[PDB]
């Protein structure tokens, strides 16, 4: 009887870029609009039921983080719904801010273009009425040219925001990829904590029980109600049996 902590892998060929790393294949990504792709899922790494040290469980489809058990009754993958959803909840609120924060680009814009709007209307004024007078000729010519210099300049903000957009993605992609690695380890530690010495650490993300742990025992480990004293002894002889 053995329990493993692991995570999700799938047929995704989506690649994002962090800063130190490029073309990193992830299971779940999201495509902003300007070549910007933010990772939502995690590193796509598909592999005796191994744990998470060298493995992303393709056979695990019910979530991001979860366990793969094996006892007398049978074996199978099972996603931790609580963990997976906290990750999804947090990442969602972040991805949204990015969409929401960049929404200052237009709010402020709405003005430069009700104003751009007012000017080339004012320019079409002078083009239609111009059908001393040619002092007003190169006068208008001076302003129309200043309108282009003005738009190029406003567009400089688009150019210089490109790069706002580009770095925010690479950085949030790392905070994210790190965030997963966190939650995964936390789950392993939470299990390692309960089991203590009633189970052997294999070092591959799996724990080898010294006592037979049925499906109910597994659920107890999952929902954090593992009774250590209950099996303490039978693990204890088993450690010394060998």
């Amino acid at each position: 009887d053995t329990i493993c902590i692991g995570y999700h892998a799938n047929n995704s060929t989506d690649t994002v870029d962090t800063v130190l790393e490029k073309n990193v294949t992830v299971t779940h990504s999201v495509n902003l609009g300007s070549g910007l792709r933010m990772v939502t899922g995690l590193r796509n790494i598909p592999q005796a039921i191994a744990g998470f040290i060298e493995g992303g469980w393709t056979g695990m489809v019910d979530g991001w983080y979860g366990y793969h058990h094996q006892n007398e009754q049978g074996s199978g993958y099972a996603a931790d719904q609580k963990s997976t959803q906290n990750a999804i909840n947090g990442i969602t609120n972040k991805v949204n801010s990015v969409i929401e924060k960049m929404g200052g680009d237009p709010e402020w814009d709405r003005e430069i273009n009700n104003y751009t709007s007012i000017i080339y209307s004012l320019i079409e004024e002078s083009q239609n009425q111009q059908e001393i007078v040619q002092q007003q000729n190169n006068l208008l010519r001076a302003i129309e040219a200043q309108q282009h210099l003005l738009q190029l300049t406003v567009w400089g903000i688009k150019q210089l925001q490109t790069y706002n957009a580009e770095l925010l993605v690479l950085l949030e992609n790392e905070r994210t990829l790190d965030f997963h690695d966190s939650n995964v380890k936390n789950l392993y530690e939470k299990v390692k904590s309960q089991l203590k010495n009633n189970a052997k650490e294999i070092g591959n993300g799996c724990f080898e029980f010294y006592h037979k742990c049925n499906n109910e025992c597994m659920e107890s480990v999952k929902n954090g109600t593992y009774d250590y004293p209950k099996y303490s002894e039978e693990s204890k002889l088993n450690r010394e049996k060998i």
Partner: antibody, heavy 121, light 109 residues
Framework: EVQLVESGAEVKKPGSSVKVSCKAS????????ISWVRQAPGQGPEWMGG????????KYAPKFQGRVTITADDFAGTVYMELSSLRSEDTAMYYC??????????????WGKGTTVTVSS | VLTQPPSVSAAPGQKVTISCSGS????????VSWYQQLPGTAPKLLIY???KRPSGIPDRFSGSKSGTSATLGITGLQTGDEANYYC????????????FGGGTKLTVL
């Protein structure tokens, strides 16, 4: 709290298809699942299907399993329900409803107002 | 499908219970939700997880689940409570799906 807005009423012929949308406020990305629940007059509600955020997994009621398709546009903060092979008894009020977590379950806390689809010859 | 009483009746201040009979595969091992529907309105969540209340729902409503049956209780009954009441849960047995009760039309006598 989240407000769920659904597309306008639809009139369709038997055998044709209809595609309804639902847009969630805030977001646009969601951290909870969304299901489509229908009500014919004057009957009890029927759960049709749902979609999980990020995973995009869909589960469908077996009664509609086969001719319903639930898709999501996460950037648009919009999900869609497309029901094909329409019959006259597909005439109903259709609600989008969000769940509390990413998992489709009996608990839908917020509901769209419903839009009417009429199927007649 | 879950079996509800077609209708149940009582007066202001008085109390009434709406039952929901299912089987082992649905009610037997899943959580039960309750919804209220006035005419011309979307279903509104009353109870979830057998007996929990969303904010906005007063302690005049309450729920219970026993084995294969579940119960909605409404005390201090008022005029606005006149509506249709549906129970809901998870039916794992077929292919897993959410199932609703036939519905109970409440009449405030």
């Amino acid at each position: 709290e989240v407000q769920l807005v659904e597309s306008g009423a639809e009139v369709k012929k038997p055998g044709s298809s209809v595609k309804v949308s639902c847009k969630a406020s805030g977001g646009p990305f969601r951290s909870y699942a969304i299901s489509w629940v229908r009500q014919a007059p004057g009957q009890g509600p029927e759960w049709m299907g749902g979609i999980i955020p990020i995973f995009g997994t869909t589960k469908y009621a077996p009664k509609f399993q086969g001719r319903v398709t639930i898709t999501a546009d996460d950037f648009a903060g919009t999900v869609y329900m497309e029901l094909s092979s329409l019959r006259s008894e597909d005439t109903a009020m259709y609600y989008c409803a969000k769940h509390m977590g990413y998992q489709v379950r009996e608990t839908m806390d917020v509901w769209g107002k419903g839009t009417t689809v009429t199927v007649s010859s | 499908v879950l079996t509800q009483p077609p209708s149940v009746s009582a007066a202001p201040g008085q109390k009434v219970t709406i039952s929901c009979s299912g089987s082992s595969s649905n009610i037997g091992n899943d959580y039960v939700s309750w919804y209220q529907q006035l005419p011309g309105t979307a279903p509104k969540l009353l109870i979830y997880d057998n007996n929990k209340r969303p904010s906005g729902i007063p302690d005049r409503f309450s729920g219970s689940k026993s084995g294969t049956s579940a119960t909605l209780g409404i005390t201090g009954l008022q005029t606005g409570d006149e509506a249709n009441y549906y129970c809901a849960t998870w039916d794992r047995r077929p292919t897993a799906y959410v199932v609703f009760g036939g519905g109970t039309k409440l009449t405030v006598l």
